[PDB]
């Protein structure tokens, strides 16, 4: 393809991965909240 933009910027990758990882964390935390047999939280 030839040389070009090396994408020397990857901090936005760290922020995006951090946010999405936190999102899976918070979503996983309450995965026991719904269902006709679901459990609840106090």
């Amino acid at each position: 393809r030839g040389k070009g933009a090396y994408q020397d910027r990857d901090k936005p990758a760290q922020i995006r991965f951090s946010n999405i990882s936190a999102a899976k964390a918070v979503a996983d935390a309450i995965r026991t909240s719904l269902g006709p047999k679901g459990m609840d939280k106090m």
């Binding site: 030839g2 933009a5 910027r9 990857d10 990758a13 760290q14 951090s18 990882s21």
Partner: protein
């Protein structure tokens, strides 16, 4: 993907890391700090600084060359340590251009950070600089010229290079008084290294003009009473023997007697054993003596009974120098009074040097090792004088080793820039901009030289690019004034080997430091 901090603490106290452009920023900030710390001193009109310690008598030493500067300072970023180490390596190799290689590396990294800010694959830059440096090496060797076919021209080139070195440091202020003198010293080398064979003596006071190289040899010790006070045409034998206690090689021996008369007998026996040893040595019939170890009181009295000159304990370097200059031997066995060669000299006598005493050794057999007398207004002057002259001696020895030289500073640089530019014309694709950035990086050096001089830079660089583009490969910046002139007549000859080595080392260090991707500091070793 790049993420090593969000999940959990994978580090103990004081342990961190930085993956993204932050690491590059840190390294480049350190590198530019190094460069400005050093680029403010490069060039024949380069500048000077002062290194001051933190407490503890505040060690003071003046220096122009940046080697000791990077040694003393506490560099923090790993790239900074890498730079100070490349500086120490270039310093040990030859010297007088360590500053140059440091500045060149820093400036290369400046264009490197710029181009990576233009989002470029580092491997491409590395390959481009490798090919460009190979081509530049070939061109510069093609420009290398051999000499030494005669004496007058070669000697003139030696004074030229000596004075050129003296420009980079402070010695320029009296460089003439140094130059020819220095030449003579390198003449006495006659095909051997170990500058330690060259001796340098400093005493506060006098003047730089008062400094001179001895027309003979010098020694700094003291002599006994029963020894004479003035001698000539001495015959010299060197020794490294134990004559203080006559310690017998067997340990465990002990006297088991009862009457103290036997003790007097055995002590007289020991004294006569020492007397017979002195007879064994004196059987060689030497006129002067040196022993590497201590001359004890009984040996000294026996020598005084003989009444000849004997020199007490000294070092290894002194005895080696004396063996060189007089052609004696360091003897530790004396059953062969005629199977040894005696050192030769013509006059040995003290000279009251101001507030000091030094013995004058004229008419020595071999004029190989030499003693240099230094005097100055401050001891810092003496320290930097010795440093700079050691650098000059290293360069002189290196150019005696190989007589391949090139034209003066920048001009060889600028023609290499011209050749690399011509390749840039031949260079297609993306590597072309990297290697032309390499080229202007090289071209930056004479600009900094002009800035250190105190003259306009852009006009000189553009005009001299025009001059070197027309084939006038001998013109260049004038050393006397901010003008342009041929250094062949001006007399600026540049040692090809030293700066080809400088270019190679700078290229290697730059590519190594550019190959980085990640800085991870470990713990600070909690106290």
């Amino acid at each position: 993907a790049s993420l090593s901090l969000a999940p959990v603490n994978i580090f103990k106290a004081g342990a961190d890391e930085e993956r993204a452009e932050t690491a590059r920023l840190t390294s480049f900030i350190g590198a530019i700090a190094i460069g400005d710390l050093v680029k403010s001193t490069l060039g024949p009109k380069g500048m000077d600084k002062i290194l001051l310690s933190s407490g503890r008598d505040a060690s003071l030493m003046v220096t122009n060359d940046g080697a000791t500067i990077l040694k003393n300072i506490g560099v923090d970023n790993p790239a900074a340590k890498v730079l100070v180490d490349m500086s120490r390596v270039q310093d040990d190799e030859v010297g007088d251009g360590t500053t140059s290689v440091t500045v060149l590396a820093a400036e290369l990294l400046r264009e490197a950070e710029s181009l990576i800010a233009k989002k470029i694959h580092p491997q491409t830059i590395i390959a481009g600089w490798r090919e460009a440096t190979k081509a530049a090496r070939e061109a510069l060797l093609s420009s290398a010229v051999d000499h030494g076919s005669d004496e007058v021209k070669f000697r003139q080139d030696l004074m030229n290079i000596a004075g050129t070195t003296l420009s980079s440091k402070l010695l320029t202020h009296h460089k003439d008084h140094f130059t020819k003198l220095a030449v003579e010293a390198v003449l006495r080398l006659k095909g051997s290294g170990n500058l330690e064979a060259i001796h340098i003596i400093k005493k506060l006071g006098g003047s730089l003009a008062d400094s001179y190289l001895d027309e003979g040899f010098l020694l700094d010790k003291k002599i006994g009473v029963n020894q004479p006070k003035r001698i000539e045409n001495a015959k010299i034998l060197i020794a490294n023997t134990g004559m203080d206690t006559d310690k017998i090689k067997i340990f465990g021996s002990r006297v088991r007697v009862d009457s103290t008369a036997k003790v007097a007998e055995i002590e007289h026996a020991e004294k006569e054993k020492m007397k017979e040893k002195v007879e064994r040595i004196l059987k060689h019939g030497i006129n002067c003596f040196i022993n590497r170890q201590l001359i004890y009181n009984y040996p000294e009295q026996l020598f005084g009974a003989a009444g000849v000159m004997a020199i007490e304990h000294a070092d290894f370097a002194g005895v080696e120098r004396l063996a060189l200059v007089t052609g004696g031997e360091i003897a530790s066995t004396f059953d062969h009074p005629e199977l040894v060669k005696l050192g030769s000299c013509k006059l040995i006598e003290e000279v009251m040097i101001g507030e000091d005493k030094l013995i004058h050794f004229s008419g020595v057999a071999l004029g190989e090792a030499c003693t240099i007398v230094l005097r100055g207004a401050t001891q810092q002057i003496l320290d930097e004088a010795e440093r700079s002259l050691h650098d000059a001696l290293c360069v002189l020895a290196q150019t005696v080793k190989d007589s391949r030289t090139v034209y003066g500073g920048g001009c060889s640089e600028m023609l290499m820039a011209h050749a690399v530019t011509q390749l840039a014309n031949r260079t297609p694709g993306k590597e072309a901009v990297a290697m032309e950035s390499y080229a202007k990086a090289l071209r930056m050096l004479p600009t900094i030289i002009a800035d250190n001089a105190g003259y306009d830079s852009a006009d000189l660089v553009a005009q001299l690019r025009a001059a070197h583009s027309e084939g006038n490969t001998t013109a260049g910046l004038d050393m006397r004034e901010g003008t342009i002139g041929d250094m062949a007549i001006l007399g600026i000859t540049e040692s090809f080997q030293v700066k080809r080595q400088v270019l190679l080392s700078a290229a290697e260090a730059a590519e190594v430091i550019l190959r980085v991707d990640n800085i991870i500091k470990a713990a600070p070793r909690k106290r």
